[PDB]
Design an enzyme around this catalytic site. Structure first.
Site, PDB file in Angstrom:
ATOM      1  N   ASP A   6     -13.121  18.454  -5.401  1.00 50.97           N
ATOM      2  CA  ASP A   6     -14.588  18.850  -5.269  1.00 50.97           C
ATOM      3  C   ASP A   6     -15.126  17.714  -4.991  1.00 50.97           C
ATOM      4  O   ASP A   6     -15.147  16.569  -5.762  1.00 50.97           O
ATOM      5  CB  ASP A   6     -15.142  19.367  -6.773  1.00 50.97           C
ATOM      6  N   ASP A  17     -18.413  18.092   3.728  1.00 50.55           N
ATOM      7  CA  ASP A  17     -17.815  18.744   2.748  1.00 50.55           C
ATOM      8  C   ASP A  17     -16.739  19.463   3.131  1.00 50.55           C
ATOM      9  O   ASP A  17     -16.825  20.697   3.537  1.00 50.55           O
ATOM     10  CB  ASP A  17     -18.837  19.377   1.749  1.00 50.55           C
TER      11      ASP A  17
END
EC number: 3.4.23.39
Length: 370
Positions: A80, A255
């Site tokens: 993450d 991301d």
């Protein structure tokens, strides 16, 4: 430098699963044929009601060889880039959902050291210290033992991982513990407080995380560094140009945890205007003929570089639904300010370096063949 491989479950994966489970093949095919035929005044691209949720486009990165303490069961961790901490479900979590997971039991670990500082990120837990191992790197580290996932229960229970390994920035609200990559550097176990992502263009279900250094084998030419424009996110500023429309100085979040290139809904609607792309009603994705010659190329520019993303990178065949049909790994997502999430598709073309010490993201064309 330590490089670990991880598996990826993307939006496309879940869409296929849904289509298969509920036999939605013909619905999609008939929907496309009708909506992409021109009977309607304009090509349907969804609406406020029929939209796409970011959760539908999560790029879940699984790593199964991480260890926390000893005398434990194996753990499955997902990466993450938005979290600073390492989260591990505790044996103290005894809900039905937790009992289906591999839980951390401090009473059995020789290296465990009590901390106990409570955490309420709802999600409840407390800090614990133990030896955390990722690849050949091991270090005493403070992580969060979760005892209650509260409302996250359903999502978590339905997921296939146990914990979360944070590759994001320290956020004092949760704690003052440095992210694991930073801590590794603090303990002089790695050369630099940085990590890189190499997502093989030819295998969307795989990715490689390198911790502590930059491996030349992953990219072509010199890296171009883009300074972060925020202290808590891997976010940089870039001018975006798509066709004859643009968004100057947009925030671009890099991301690997997002399966698409996300674009402000208004901008996406203008982009896809009459380009023979349609949103499947009530289903989380846009579709178009793979041979569509009208598809735009994304162009992102900074004072130091220009990065582009051609259609091949955001198109993915959905052959099981219909021949020659492709879904787009592009979704409409609004933020308070003009923002793009440069997810997986962007990173399949570009090798990326996330530098904590230098607060920047390094970019270079990824080597397609190592």
């Amino acid at each position: 430098h330590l490089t670990i491989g991880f598996k990826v479950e993307n939006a496309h994966d879940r869409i296929l699963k849904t289509i298969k489970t509920h036999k939605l093949k013909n619905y999609i095919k008939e929907s496309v044929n009708f909506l992409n035929s021109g009977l309607t005044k304009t090509n349907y691209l969804g609406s406020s009601n029929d939209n796409i949720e970011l959760v539908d486009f999560q790029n879940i990165m699984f790593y199964g060889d991480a260890e926390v303490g000893d005398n434990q069961q194996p753990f499955t961790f997902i990466l993450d880039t938005g979290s600073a901490n390492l989260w591990v479900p505790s044996v103290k979590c005894t809900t039905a959902g937790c009992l289906t997971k591999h839980l951390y039991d401090s009473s059995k670990s020789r290296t465990y050291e009590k901390d106990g500082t409570k955490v309420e990120m709802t999600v409840s837990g407390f800090f614990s210290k133990d030896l955390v191992t990722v690849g050949n790197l091991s270090l005493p580290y403070k992580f969060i033992e979760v005892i209650d996932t509260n409302g996250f229960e359903p999502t978590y229970t339905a997921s296939t991982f146990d914990g979360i390994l944070g590759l994001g920035w320290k956020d004092l609200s949760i704690g003052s513990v440095d992210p694991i990559v930073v801590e590794l550097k603090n303990q002089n176990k790695i050369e630099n407080a940085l990590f890189t992502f190499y997502l093989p263009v030819h295998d969307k279900h795989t990715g490689f995380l390198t911790i502590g250094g930059i491996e030349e084998r992953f990219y072509e030419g010199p890296l171009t560094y883009e300074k972060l424009n925020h202290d808590l996110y891997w976010q940089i500023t870039l001018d975006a140009h798509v066709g004859n429309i643009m968004l100057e100085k947009a925030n671009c979040i890099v991301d690997s945890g997002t399966s698409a290139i996300t674009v402000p809904t208004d901008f996406l609607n203008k982009m896809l205007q009459n380009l023979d792309v349609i949103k499947v009603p009530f289903l989380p994705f846009y579709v178009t003929l793979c041979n569509n010659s009208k598809l735009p190329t994304f162009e992102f520019t900074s004072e130091n570089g220009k990065y582009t993303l051609e259609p091949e990178y955001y198109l993915q065949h959905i052959e099981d639904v219909g021949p020659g049909l492709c879904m787009l790994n592009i979704i409409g997502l609004d933020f308070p300010v003009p923002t793009f999430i440069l997810g997986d598709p962007f990173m399949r073309k570009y090798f990326t370096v996330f530098d904590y010490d230098n607060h920047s993201v390094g970019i270079a064309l990824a080597k397609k063949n190592l």
